[PDB]
Amino acid sequence: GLMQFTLPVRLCKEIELFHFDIGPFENMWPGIFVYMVHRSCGTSCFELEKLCRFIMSVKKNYRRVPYHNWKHAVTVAHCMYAILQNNHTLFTDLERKGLLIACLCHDLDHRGFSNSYLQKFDHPLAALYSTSTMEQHHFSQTVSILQLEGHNIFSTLSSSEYEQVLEIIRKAIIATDLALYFGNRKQLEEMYQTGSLNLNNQSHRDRVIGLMMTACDLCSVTKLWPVTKLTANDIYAEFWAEGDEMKKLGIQPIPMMDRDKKDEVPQGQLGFYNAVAIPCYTTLTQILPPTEPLLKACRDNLSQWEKVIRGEE
């Protein structure tokens, strides 16, 4: 209880910034995560013995895939930690608790395949959940781990706060289905421009938390160029394995997943930055002004992809 966590000076300082990279030492990710809950939520939010066991069971149920892995989870939790510490007073005690957990759990047990591949392969998870297949699976795995003995980190919540927090985490995890993002931003855009957006409207909060989740999940585009460039290799390594599998089923994959068409990657990042990231972080900054650094950083990296095409790198 009087047992704090402290990081080295450079991390203690760098961790508060949006473009923080968590580093290549796995064994520090759990303490980074705990350090973030303690400063974000309080030293009193979670019983340390239980939280630690929950963190380690979460790590265990992430797989060894190039991109949708344990490192991805802690990255996306840290980005949410940045958003919550730059918007201190806009968020309830419960929201802070569940959003950091939602982010850590958001891709539990990912196999490195798209919802599409599960339906074209006819995977059992496509039989059980017809939309946001993996994301419904991810939430389900979160509840599993929350019901392992000694793992209920929410034990001290009322019956009703417990249901409130499991609902914040369910919508939050569903929201990371990027297919759902496009409508969610369109609505938020129109609600802010017409002046209807109201943060005491629970269905408005839900959309807003929805957009933070897409923001945190996409945060490789908001990092320093060498981190962005090296993460994109991991992103394409999964997509190309999926394309490989698509070809095995007897289906031409989309070019994004065709390793024959690597040459077009720079042009594909452009499309993606314009269609997805820039809109994401534009709409997010209008709603949440102190997240501007995410937009500025995303814009810099768009500019760095434009450079790659012009053969300037």
Ligand SMILES: Cc1ncc(C)n2nc(CCc3nc(-c4ccccc4)cn3C)nc12
């Ligand atoms: C979900 C996600 N998070 C973060 C990042 C950075 N990314 N980057 C993509 C692929 C973008 C992309 N690459 C192509 C393409 C590539 C080669 C040939 C032809 C097309 C199309 N698109 C959309 N997805 C994500």
Ligand SMILES: [Mg+2]
């Ligand atoms: Mg996901």
Ligand SMILES: [Zn+2]
């Ligand atoms: Zn993710």
